Structures are given as structure tokens and as C-alpha cells.
Amino acid sequence: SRCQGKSSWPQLVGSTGAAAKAVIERENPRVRAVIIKVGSGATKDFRCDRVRVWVTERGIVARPPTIG
Ligand SMILES: [K+]
Ligand code: NA
Ligand code: NA
């Protein structure tokens, strides 16, 4: 019965990746946030325990973090 809880963090765009990771992982204890640079690619599968945090070259969140 996975994927419950908060599952998207639209207000974290524009935040730093580190700030975002901590907010995500505090608000939903069933996920781990993964910082990844925009354009670098990540597996195209679906996981309820993962939140990709897509960041610019300066480490700013550039897409709304969502479970998947
Ligand atoms: K914001
Ligand atoms: Na949010
Ligand atoms: Na994700």
C-alpha cells in the first residue's frame, strides 16, 4: 500500500536542493529525495519511495519534486 502521504512539493521550485531534500524527507518519512542535475537522466521506472529533486548547475530546484 505504498505512495500515501504528501506526494508533490510544488513550492520547492526555486529553493536549494539541500533545503528541498530536508523538507521532503521530513514531510513524508516514506521517501528519500535524490538530487539530480537537470538533463542527466534517471531510470524511467516508478517508485513510491523516491523523490527526484532536479536541480540547475547552481543546485537550485528547477522542477516540482514529486514521488516516482
Ligand atoms: K518556491
Ligand atoms: Na510544497
Ligand atoms: Na521522483
Side-chain angles (χ1 to χ4, degrees):
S1 306
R2 292 173 176 176
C3 277
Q4 300 182 31
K6 185 168 179 182
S7 55
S8 191
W9 288 261
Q11 298 189 50
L12 296 176
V13 300
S15 298
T16 66
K21 171 171 174 76
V23 169
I24 291 162
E25 288 181 11
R26 288 157 66 106
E27 290 188 340
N28 191 333
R30 296 181 294 183
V31 305
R32 171 170 172 266
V34 58
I35 307 288
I36 311 175
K37 186 164 171 221
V38 165
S40 67
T43 56
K44 297 288 195 180
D45 62 351
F46 180 87
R47 291 255 302 290
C48 288
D49 56 298
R50 181 175 57 202
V51 176
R52 293 178 168 145
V53 181
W54 293 101
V55 296
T56 72
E57 59 291 345
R58 300 181 194 165
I60 298 297
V61 180
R63 304 288 187 281
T66 301
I67 293 180

PDB file of all heavy atoms in Angstrom, residues 7 32 34 36 45-47 49-54 64-68, ligand 3:
ATOM      1  N   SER A   7       2.810  13.901  -1.709  1.00  0.00           N
ATOM      2  CA  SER A   7       3.494  13.295  -2.831  1.00  0.00           C
ATOM      3  C   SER A   7       4.005  14.271  -3.896  1.00  0.00           C
ATOM      4  O   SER A   7       4.632  13.856  -4.842  1.00  0.00           O
ATOM      5  CB  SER A   7       2.633  12.189  -3.431  1.00  0.00           C
ATOM      6  OG  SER A   7       1.406  12.707  -3.763  1.00  0.00           O
ATOM      7  N   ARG A  32      12.839   9.079   0.124  1.00  0.00           N
ATOM      8  CA  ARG A  32      14.175   9.640   0.088  1.00  0.00           C
ATOM      9  C   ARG A  32      14.280  10.513  -1.132  1.00  0.00           C
ATOM     10  O   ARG A  32      13.907  10.101  -2.256  1.00  0.00           O
ATOM     11  CB  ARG A  32      15.230   8.498   0.021  1.00  0.00           C
ATOM     12  CG  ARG A  32      16.629   9.009  -0.229  1.00  0.00           C
ATOM     13  CD  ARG A  32      17.675   7.911  -0.057  1.00  0.00           C
ATOM     14  NE  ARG A  32      18.989   8.334  -0.477  1.00  0.00           N
ATOM     15  CZ  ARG A  32      19.520   8.141  -1.701  1.00  0.00           C
ATOM     16  NH1 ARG A  32      18.863   7.413  -2.610  1.00  0.00           N
ATOM     17  NH2 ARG A  32      20.710   8.632  -1.972  1.00  0.00           N
ATOM     18  N   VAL A  34      16.446  12.503  -3.911  1.00  0.00           N
ATOM     19  CA  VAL A  34      17.633  12.244  -4.721  1.00  0.00           C
ATOM     20  C   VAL A  34      17.928  13.509  -5.524  1.00  0.00           C
ATOM     21  O   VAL A  34      17.106  13.823  -6.362  1.00  0.00           O
ATOM     22  CB  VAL A  34      17.410  11.031  -5.637  1.00  0.00           C
ATOM     23  CG1 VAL A  34      16.235  11.189  -6.559  1.00  0.00           C
ATOM     24  CG2 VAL A  34      18.693  10.677  -6.410  1.00  0.00           C
ATOM     25  N   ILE A  36      19.520  15.482  -8.484  1.00  0.00           N
ATOM     26  CA  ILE A  36      19.998  15.112  -9.801  1.00  0.00           C
ATOM     27  C   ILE A  36      20.007  16.361 -10.671  1.00  0.00           C
ATOM     28  O   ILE A  36      19.032  17.108 -10.681  1.00  0.00           O
ATOM     29  CB  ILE A  36      19.111  14.076 -10.522  1.00  0.00           C
ATOM     30  CG1 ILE A  36      18.787  12.890  -9.649  1.00  0.00           C
ATOM     31  CG2 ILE A  36      19.830  13.672 -11.797  1.00  0.00           C
ATOM     32  CD1 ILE A  36      17.812  11.926 -10.310  1.00  0.00           C
ATOM     33  N   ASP A  45      11.460   4.256 -14.491  1.00  0.00           N
ATOM     34  CA  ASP A  45      10.590   3.353 -13.759  1.00  0.00           C
ATOM     35  C   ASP A  45       9.841   4.175 -12.683  1.00  0.00           C
ATOM     36  O   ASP A  45       9.972   5.412 -12.604  1.00  0.00           O
ATOM     37  CB  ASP A  45      11.299   2.160 -13.175  1.00  0.00           C
ATOM     38  CG  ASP A  45      12.347   2.519 -12.154  1.00  0.00           C
ATOM     39  OD1 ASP A  45      12.668   3.714 -11.992  1.00  0.00           O
ATOM     40  OD2 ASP A  45      12.884   1.551 -11.514  1.00  0.00           O
ATOM     41  N   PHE A  46       9.048   3.507 -11.903  1.00  0.00           N
ATOM     42  CA  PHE A  46       8.168   4.167 -10.924  1.00  0.00           C
ATOM     43  C   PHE A  46       8.438   3.552  -9.570  1.00  0.00           C
ATOM     44  O   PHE A  46       8.318   2.332  -9.402  1.00  0.00           O
ATOM     45  CB  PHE A  46       6.707   4.048 -11.305  1.00  0.00           C
ATOM     46  CG  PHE A  46       5.830   4.749 -10.276  1.00  0.00           C
ATOM     47  CD1 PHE A  46       5.579   6.089 -10.404  1.00  0.00           C
ATOM     48  CD2 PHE A  46       5.262   4.024  -9.232  1.00  0.00           C
ATOM     49  CE1 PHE A  46       4.841   6.783  -9.421  1.00  0.00           C
ATOM     50  CE2 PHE A  46       4.498   4.677  -8.289  1.00  0.00           C
ATOM     51  CZ  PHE A  46       4.280   6.038  -8.403  1.00  0.00           C
ATOM     52  N   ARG A  47       8.728   4.402  -8.604  1.00  0.00           N
ATOM     53  CA  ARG A  47       8.984   4.005  -7.233  1.00  0.00           C
ATOM     54  C   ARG A  47       8.274   4.953  -6.272  1.00  0.00           C
ATOM     55  O   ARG A  47       8.481   6.166  -6.324  1.00  0.00           O
ATOM     56  CB  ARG A  47      10.505   4.106  -6.983  1.00  0.00           C
ATOM     57  CG  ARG A  47      11.381   3.101  -7.709  1.00  0.00           C
ATOM     58  CD  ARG A  47      11.923   1.957  -6.792  1.00  0.00           C
ATOM     59  NE  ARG A  47      12.642   2.611  -5.743  1.00  0.00           N
ATOM     60  CZ  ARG A  47      13.763   3.250  -5.822  1.00  0.00           C
ATOM     61  NH1 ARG A  47      14.490   3.213  -6.960  1.00  0.00           N
ATOM     62  NH2 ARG A  47      14.262   3.896  -4.763  1.00  0.00           N
ATOM     63  N   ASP A  49       8.946   5.284  -3.141  1.00  0.00           N
ATOM     64  CA  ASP A  49       9.847   5.671  -2.068  1.00  0.00           C
ATOM     65  C   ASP A  49      10.885   6.703  -2.510  1.00  0.00           C
ATOM     66  O   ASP A  49      11.776   7.041  -1.720  1.00  0.00           O
ATOM     67  CB  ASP A  49      10.580   4.432  -1.508  1.00  0.00           C
ATOM     68  CG  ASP A  49      11.326   3.669  -2.581  1.00  0.00           C
ATOM     69  OD1 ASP A  49      10.692   3.163  -3.509  1.00  0.00           O
ATOM     70  OD2 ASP A  49      12.562   3.505  -2.445  1.00  0.00           O
ATOM     71  N   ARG A  50      10.773   7.197  -3.739  1.00  0.00           N
ATOM     72  CA  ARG A  50      11.780   8.061  -4.341  1.00  0.00           C
ATOM     73  C   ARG A  50      11.160   9.411  -4.725  1.00  0.00           C
ATOM     74  O   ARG A  50      10.078   9.432  -5.297  1.00  0.00           O
ATOM     75  CB  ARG A  50      12.283   7.396  -5.623  1.00  0.00           C
ATOM     76  CG  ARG A  50      13.368   8.153  -6.375  1.00  0.00           C
ATOM     77  CD  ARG A  50      13.905   7.369  -7.562  1.00  0.00           C
ATOM     78  NE  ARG A  50      12.856   7.006  -8.502  1.00  0.00           N
ATOM     79  CZ  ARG A  50      12.944   6.007  -9.375  1.00  0.00           C
ATOM     80  NH1 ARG A  50      14.026   5.216  -9.386  1.00  0.00           N
ATOM     81  NH2 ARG A  50      11.937   5.768 -10.222  1.00  0.00           N
ATOM     82  N   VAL A  51      11.897  10.475  -4.443  1.00  0.00           N
ATOM     83  CA  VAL A  51      11.549  11.821  -4.935  1.00  0.00           C
ATOM     84  C   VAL A  51      12.796  12.381  -5.611  1.00  0.00           C
ATOM     85  O   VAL A  51      13.747  12.749  -4.915  1.00  0.00           O
ATOM     86  CB  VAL A  51      11.036  12.744  -3.839  1.00  0.00           C
ATOM     87  CG1 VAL A  51      10.778  14.144  -4.402  1.00  0.00           C
ATOM     88  CG2 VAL A  51       9.762  12.207  -3.204  1.00  0.00           C
ATOM     89  N   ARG A  52      12.763  12.485  -6.914  1.00  0.00           N
ATOM     90  CA  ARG A  52      13.836  13.163  -7.638  1.00  0.00           C
ATOM     91  C   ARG A  52      13.738  14.664  -7.463  1.00  0.00           C
ATOM     92  O   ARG A  52      12.651  15.228  -7.666  1.00  0.00           O
ATOM     93  CB  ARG A  52      13.788  12.765  -9.109  1.00  0.00           C
ATOM     94  CG  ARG A  52      14.151  11.281  -9.234  1.00  0.00           C
ATOM     95  CD  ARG A  52      14.098  10.763 -10.621  1.00  0.00           C
ATOM     96  NE  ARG A  52      14.752   9.447 -10.583  1.00  0.00           N
ATOM     97  CZ  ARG A  52      14.160   8.590 -11.445  1.00  0.00           C
ATOM     98  NH1 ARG A  52      13.152   9.079 -12.117  1.00  0.00           N
ATOM     99  NH2 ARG A  52      14.707   7.445 -11.497  1.00  0.00           N
ATOM    100  N   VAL A  53      14.828  15.281  -7.135  1.00  0.00           N
ATOM    101  CA  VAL A  53      14.951  16.707  -6.980  1.00  0.00           C
ATOM    102  C   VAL A  53      15.891  17.202  -8.083  1.00  0.00           C
ATOM    103  O   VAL A  53      17.087  17.052  -7.969  1.00  0.00           O
ATOM    104  CB  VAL A  53      15.442  17.100  -5.594  1.00  0.00           C
ATOM    105  CG1 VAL A  53      15.535  18.621  -5.479  1.00  0.00           C
ATOM    106  CG2 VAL A  53      14.502  16.545  -4.511  1.00  0.00           C
ATOM    107  N   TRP A  54      15.264  17.734  -9.150  1.00  0.00           N
ATOM    108  CA  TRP A  54      16.015  18.132 -10.328  1.00  0.00           C
ATOM    109  C   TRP A  54      16.548  19.554 -10.137  1.00  0.00           C
ATOM    110  O   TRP A  54      15.749  20.458  -9.888  1.00  0.00           O
ATOM    111  CB  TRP A  54      15.123  18.087 -11.554  1.00  0.00           C
ATOM    112  CG  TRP A  54      14.687  16.698 -11.928  1.00  0.00           C
ATOM    113  CD1 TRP A  54      13.475  16.101 -11.669  1.00  0.00           C
ATOM    114  CD2 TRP A  54      15.467  15.773 -12.687  1.00  0.00           C
ATOM    115  NE1 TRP A  54      13.470  14.820 -12.209  1.00  0.00           N
ATOM    116  CE2 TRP A  54      14.675  14.601 -12.842  1.00  0.00           C
ATOM    117  CE3 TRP A  54      16.730  15.796 -13.249  1.00  0.00           C
ATOM    118  CZ2 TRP A  54      15.141  13.467 -13.533  1.00  0.00           C
ATOM    119  CZ3 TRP A  54      17.197  14.686 -13.944  1.00  0.00           C
ATOM    120  CH2 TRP A  54      16.389  13.559 -14.077  1.00  0.00           C
ATOM    121  N   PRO A  64       9.140  20.665 -10.132  1.00  0.00           N
ATOM    122  CA  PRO A  64       8.405  20.376  -8.834  1.00  0.00           C
ATOM    123  C   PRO A  64       8.688  18.967  -8.360  1.00  0.00           C
ATOM    124  O   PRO A  64       8.357  18.002  -9.070  1.00  0.00           O
ATOM    125  CB  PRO A  64       6.905  20.542  -9.232  1.00  0.00           C
ATOM    126  CG  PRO A  64       6.904  20.378 -10.692  1.00  0.00           C
ATOM    127  CD  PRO A  64       8.193  20.822 -11.249  1.00  0.00           C
ATOM    128  N   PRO A  65       9.325  18.769  -7.220  1.00  0.00           N
ATOM    129  CA  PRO A  65       9.625  17.413  -6.792  1.00  0.00           C
ATOM    130  C   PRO A  65       8.357  16.612  -6.543  1.00  0.00           C
ATOM    131  O   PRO A  65       7.447  17.094  -5.882  1.00  0.00           O
ATOM    132  CB  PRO A  65      10.441  17.609  -5.511  1.00  0.00           C
ATOM    133  CG  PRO A  65      11.045  18.986  -5.643  1.00  0.00           C
ATOM    134  CD  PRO A  65       9.954  19.773  -6.326  1.00  0.00           C
ATOM    135  N   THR A  66       8.340  15.385  -7.055  1.00  0.00           N
ATOM    136  CA  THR A  66       7.164  14.530  -6.956  1.00  0.00           C
ATOM    137  C   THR A  66       7.632  13.101  -6.704  1.00  0.00           C
ATOM    138  O   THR A  66       8.664  12.699  -7.235  1.00  0.00           O
ATOM    139  CB  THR A  66       6.407  14.649  -8.308  1.00  0.00           C
ATOM    140  OG1 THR A  66       6.059  16.058  -8.480  1.00  0.00           O
ATOM    141  CG2 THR A  66       5.138  13.843  -8.251  1.00  0.00           C
ATOM    142  N   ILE A  67       6.865  12.327  -5.959  1.00  0.00           N
ATOM    143  CA  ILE A  67       7.143  10.896  -5.820  1.00  0.00           C
ATOM    144  C   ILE A  67       7.114  10.237  -7.190  1.00  0.00           C
ATOM    145  O   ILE A  67       6.248  10.483  -8.038  1.00  0.00           O
ATOM    146  CB  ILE A  67       6.144  10.209  -4.897  1.00  0.00           C
ATOM    147  CG1 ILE A  67       6.299  10.698  -3.451  1.00  0.00           C
ATOM    148  CG2 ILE A  67       6.284   8.698  -4.988  1.00  0.00           C
ATOM    149  CD1 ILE A  67       5.340  10.069  -2.445  1.00  0.00           C
ATOM    150  N   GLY A  68       8.084   9.370  -7.426  1.00  0.00           N
ATOM    151  CA  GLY A  68       8.097   8.487  -8.591  1.00  0.00           C
ATOM    152  C   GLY A  68       9.461   7.970  -8.927  1.00  0.00           C
ATOM    153  O   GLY A  68      10.470   8.548  -8.474  1.00  0.00           O
TER     154      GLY A  68
HETATM  155 NA    NA B   3      10.629  11.230  -8.371  1.00  0.00          NA
END
